[PDB]
Amino acid sequence: PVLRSVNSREPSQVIFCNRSPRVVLPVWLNFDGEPQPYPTLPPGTGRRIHSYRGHLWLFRDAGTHDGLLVNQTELFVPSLNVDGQPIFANITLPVYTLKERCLQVVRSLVKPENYRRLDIVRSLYEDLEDHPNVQKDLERLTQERI
Amino acid sequence: PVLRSVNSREPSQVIFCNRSPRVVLPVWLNFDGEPQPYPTLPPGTGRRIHSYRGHLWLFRDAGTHDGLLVNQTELFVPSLNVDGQPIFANITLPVYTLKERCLQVVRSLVKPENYRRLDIVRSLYEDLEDHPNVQKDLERLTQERIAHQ
Amino acid sequence: VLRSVNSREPSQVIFCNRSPRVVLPVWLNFDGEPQPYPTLPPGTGRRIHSYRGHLWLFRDAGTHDGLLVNQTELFVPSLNVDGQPIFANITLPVYTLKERCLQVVRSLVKPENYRRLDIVRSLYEDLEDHPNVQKDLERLTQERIAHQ
Amino acid sequence: VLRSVNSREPSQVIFCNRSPRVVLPVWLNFDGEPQPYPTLPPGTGRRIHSYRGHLWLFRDAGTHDGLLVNQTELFVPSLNVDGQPIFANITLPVYTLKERCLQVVRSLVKPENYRRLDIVRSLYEDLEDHPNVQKDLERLTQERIAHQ
Amino acid sequence: MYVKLISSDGHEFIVKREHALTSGTIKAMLSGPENETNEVNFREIPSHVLSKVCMYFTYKVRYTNSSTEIPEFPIAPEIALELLMAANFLDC
Amino acid sequence: MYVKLISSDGHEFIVKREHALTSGTIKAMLSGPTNEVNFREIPSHVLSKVCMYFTYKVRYTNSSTEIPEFPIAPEIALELLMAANFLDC
Amino acid sequence: MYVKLISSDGHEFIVKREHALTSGTIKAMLSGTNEVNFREIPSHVLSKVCMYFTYKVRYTNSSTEIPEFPIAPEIALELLMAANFLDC
Amino acid sequence: MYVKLISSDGHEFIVKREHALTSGTIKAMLSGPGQTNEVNFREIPSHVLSKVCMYFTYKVRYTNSSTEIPEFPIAPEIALELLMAANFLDC
Amino acid sequence: LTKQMNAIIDTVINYKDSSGRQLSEVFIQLPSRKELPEYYELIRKPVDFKKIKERIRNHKYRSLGDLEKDVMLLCHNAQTFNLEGSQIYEDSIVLQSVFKSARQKIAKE
Amino acid sequence: LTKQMNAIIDTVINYKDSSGRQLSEVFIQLPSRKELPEYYELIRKPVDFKKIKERIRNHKYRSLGDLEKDVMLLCHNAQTFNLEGSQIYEDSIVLQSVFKSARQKIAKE
Amino acid sequence: DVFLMIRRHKTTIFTDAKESSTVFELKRIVEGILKRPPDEQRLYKDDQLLDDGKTLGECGFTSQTARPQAPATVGLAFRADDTFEALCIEPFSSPPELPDVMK
Amino acid sequence: MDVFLMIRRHKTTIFTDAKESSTVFELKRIVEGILKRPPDEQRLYKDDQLLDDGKTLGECGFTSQTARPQAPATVGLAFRADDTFEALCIEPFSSPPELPDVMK
């Protein structure tokens, strides 16, 4: 397991700031590197959260499981606090591919049983059916580091 | 000088994000601990800047040198960058005292030569005249750290 | 009130979703404001870290329909005895046929179209009154002022 | 060491049998003697009217095989909070492949015929060592003298 | 005893008295002064609806005071509206 | 815990006691061996806004949600500055 | 350096070459052309496909928080088709 | 990682290493100095070693897992040989 | 004065509300900074109910108005850091009301 | 011998891998039983890297082969119990390989 | 959250509110503070009658119209022994005409 | 919505899991990882029917309720020799001895 938190015993105060228009699901990777869902952040708010140094986090659209960004990257790892200053996690939309973005909208308008009714190619139908997923994306992020 | 940057030689990529309605003056404390003005951030903008680990920063209203906050505190010191991920400096309004806030507005509406025409107390007149300043605030921040160390 | 009192003593709990629905666990904070937590898929069960005296509530993540935990509306973990984990069994209640029908109609018709259904206006108003955590919390308080 | 506590304070409990087996609830008396109680068929649940501090244990009514309640071996009801009932979730443990095999062999072959199986001598002893509430209670005592 | 509920089209539904009483409207019609007579007639409720209304009585009676999991009472889209109407009239 | 602030023109303002205490001068006047306090010098259009600040300060101090500017109209600015200084807000 | 994309109905769209190249399929059709013709893409769609190029080019690598690229229901399906056909 | 378990008759079983390590005796044979990916059982037939793997699948999956576990089924026909195999492995 | 100062501080601590629960026990000792770094970043002058018993033995408080000034300071320190409706918030509102009735009984009767 | 025993135990602790992270950070202090009751039900003879520094001052280890016997015991108390390929499991494989090169440099050079 | 100023003729209440909370719940909060039972006052949204059980959200109070420093202003009435009171809107004190120095 | 599988070709048997939502192609890639033969040299069968690389295991017929860890569903495997694929051949596992009379 390449992508995992590190047991540290040193607390790190963090500010999760949701500057996406969506409800955000913070996802803490455990020491085994298994995603752990945490309480959702409503759009346009922030919370101070108690995490630990070296702990690895990831953020996503609580509804669609769409990919988000934190400090213009995909993973957030709190640094050691400097003189008690809280670290800041700025959560934002990425620039989705036109395709992925369209899928998002179609998926949001059409019931999954009706994907069948759209006059589109089978490949597109499969893409519509293939909902985004933290685990699939974690596997991809490993190969992008390997 | 307790409050100063630390010569480090380890670069730290940072994102200055101005989430105040005002033009922000980033102020880098030098190794001697002398404030150094840097290029201003327009309201609602964010840029990636090259700084170093342990370097101490401070942010203020470029126009009137009013105090701002970064990550809910007064000083920002970048952590060592981890795996290329940039550190984030979120710059915001503080909750100004009602007085200080009023001064701000009066100062912005009345020419300094006319502060004397306002039917207010002399003490208030002095307060109007006393524009905020980085150095005065640095001195205060030191006395606030002599109780913690 | 629905206080969810600070304990500082951890209470290991098992959230077991034995409803056919996706379950939204709702933790009442110290101020007593509902806090949405990660959803439980139907037929799933996980160990969660809560604290003694913390007050929880469960609902259909989609419809915000009312669920039950251990045949009641609120769950408050007891202090663990000898480290044994407490169990929160989340289930459907027996909804009235009416409320159940509303649920189904609401799930099939877009809210802006409730007006187009050839039914009585009273039923339309009932459709429009979507279930809601806050309304139900207010009711549970008056049910505690009525036990006073 | 391992016994119920006379309390006089009632604690409503829900025995939920989520094992595939018929479950024998076993109440430890104040003297600490196991007391068999009425069996729960697989997939059933009952409200039980027990008392605070009373110590319970669950087992396969037939084989006397060990079960789990709330992912542990003993269940002790906490005092009810706001009238809410405690929940005892009874399930299979993950038996070792060996112990599981023994269970099946033991269920197919009469104990006097264990001798006829063309197997290793150690296994003959293992088949003969039928699971037993008392043996397990003795073990649990030494596991509580080891944690103090 | 049992009780007879009769649909508009004229189907007869024989259900336990206690099962039927789940409906306040029925409770009223039966307990209203032989006395507590066996039959009640619904001129505006069709069979495909009143059939399902009974199925609910069966369900409610059975799964009320069931300690572990209860299963979803299913309602097909095709019947949902008329059932909602019937449900409200019955008070069940 | 609510408290009554009364303006010169005689308007009554009921605000949480804790909200009021944000003013050192009020803290002084209230603390020690009263729930009404009278301001002979402060008109309503001012004392109203002084309260609105208490609301603002209490709510947004230590709040992670980015803080909005506490607005002051020119017409009220000077009298508020006076009131502000007297109160120690 | 600008490039001409032409819709089925025959509207002409002049967009920066670099903006267009965001599409792998356009990259393929050009690289090895100044005009490209889309026989199966109507204007109301190809217009919006360009608007995406504008968006992607501008907001990729922005520290300033990125805004949602809006798609109206009326256009969603045909855009999804066009989007898939284009590599973007 | 996947490990190869080979039955007496010579069937190959490719199972995850973590799933396999559930057998203490295999843990010994692999973590020992040896000279691994393969382990050979000359006395365990396929119809048995197949089911031994199915247990690894089961054990790994339904452990560190809470509300309900299902019975690990064993048909009479296989019971004895499995019990033998089971003992010879740690479980 | 020390006998009177102990009667007032011990009455506020021993004080139980009308459900039998003691309000003081969580205010009796402050948390470590390791535990809760937010209180020591947001609260200026941290003081507890054992740091008040400490300053009653050391005779740092010169009058019954100096003992009150620092019981209001911690009860007000709690209110800022905790929420308006929090269980800890409204008890520091009651601990100020039970200290102001406890000093009024001992100092003048 | 104590100077040599400290050089070997301090080198294994201070040892960072080729990403800059210190491996011994998790092994420095064993967890409490309250925290993790499984480690104390499955591991027979629990020992950490501070319980080895304790036994270097108390002189319980008579040779450099007795210090090694209990560094292999904790590193194996990982290997028997712990997940193969886990973060801690491979570190105890490396901490045995960095102890066997650290004793081989100090004891004979 | 929604921030509100409830005014009688001379009196002004500044208080907390939830968008999701209802006009009824709000009357009860006032009852708790002004010590007069919930049924005896009727509430005005800019001088119009307010529905006894609608949520402040549905009444029109939003984040954008009911901020802590610009609370949304809703009218309160005391009806005593069947007395109907027309809304008496006492103004707050007026500010002096804008000084030449600020303009 | 997890499925437990035995992918078997001849005397080889791979034990692995996959999502209902995962695709026949992704499964071929897992086999590639183990048996070192690409997805274009593999054919995967559910019983005797050939499975299209683009379909989800779900759509092929595999479900959580029939692919349980202790009763894995069997996916048949065929490799390609030159221009033609071998027949799907899954050599059966050994038979157990008749029940001893004591276990009647």
Ligand SMILES: Cc1ncsc1-c1ccc([C@H](C)NC(=O)[C@@H]2C[C@@H](O)CN2C(=O)[C@@H](c2cc(O[C@@H](C)CN3CC[C@@H](N4CCN5c6cc(-c7ccccc7O)nnc6NC[C@H]5C4)C3)no2)C(C)C)cc1
């Ligand atoms: C996977 C999945 N699936 C479906 S759901 C789910 C899931 C579920 C849960 C989680 C996450 C991990 N868990 C949770 O969210 C849980 C659950 C629910 O219970 C809330 N909670 C939380 O974590 C809150 C929380 C944490 C906390 O911990 C304190 C008790 C311990 N803290 C140290 C110190 C103490 N207090 C000490 C005095 N202190 C003060 C003292 C004073 C004071 C004293 C003396 C004199 C003067 C003074 O002023 N003043 N103020 C004080 N204020 C602070 C106080 C702190 C607190 N309790 O609750 C978190 C979220 C808030 C994930 C997934």
Ligand SMILES: Cc1ncsc1-c1ccc([C@H](C)NC(=O)[C@@H]2C[C@@H](O)CN2C(=O)[C@@H](c2cc(O[C@@H](C)CN3CC[C@@H](N4CCN5c6cc(-c7ccccc7O)nnc6NC[C@H]5C4)C3)no2)C(C)C)cc1
């Ligand atoms: C259907 C189904 N399916 C699956 S299971 C199941 C099922 C479930 C339940 C039941 C049945 C209905 N329920 C049970 O079997 C339950 C369950 C389990 O908990 C044991 N139990 C029992 O009922 C025992 C039991 C009953 C009892 O009741 C006392 C608390 C009430 N008592 C009044 C008085 C007080 N004590 C007060 C001091 N007192 C003494 C005082 C003194 C003393 C005092 C002062 C000065 C000098 C003195 O000497 N001395 N000695 C005392 N001893 C007595 C004591 C009494 C408690 N508690 O436990 C029964 C079996 C024993 C069936 C199936």
Ligand SMILES: Cc1ncsc1-c1ccc([C@H](C)NC(=O)[C@@H]2C[C@@H](O)CN2C(=O)[C@@H](c2cc(O[C@@H](C)CN3CC[C@@H](N4CCN5c6cc(-c7ccccc7O)nnc6NC[C@H]5C4)C3)no2)C(C)C)cc1
């Ligand atoms: C409001 C809101 N909104 C959006 S999100 C949110 C929110 C955010 C946060 C919280 C709450 C308050 N905060 C959190 O939940 C934070 C955040 C995130 O960073 C995880 N975390 C936690 O609290 C976990 C946590 C705590 C911990 O501290 C370790 C250093 C100390 N722990 C005990 C000791 C160590 N041990 C590590 C070896 N481990 C052992 C393993 C083995 C072993 C291994 C393999 C094989 C065999 C073996 O035996 N052996 N011994 C071990 N020792 C003990 C054990 C644990 C970890 N780290 O993470 C908590 C949940 C676990 C709330 C809301």
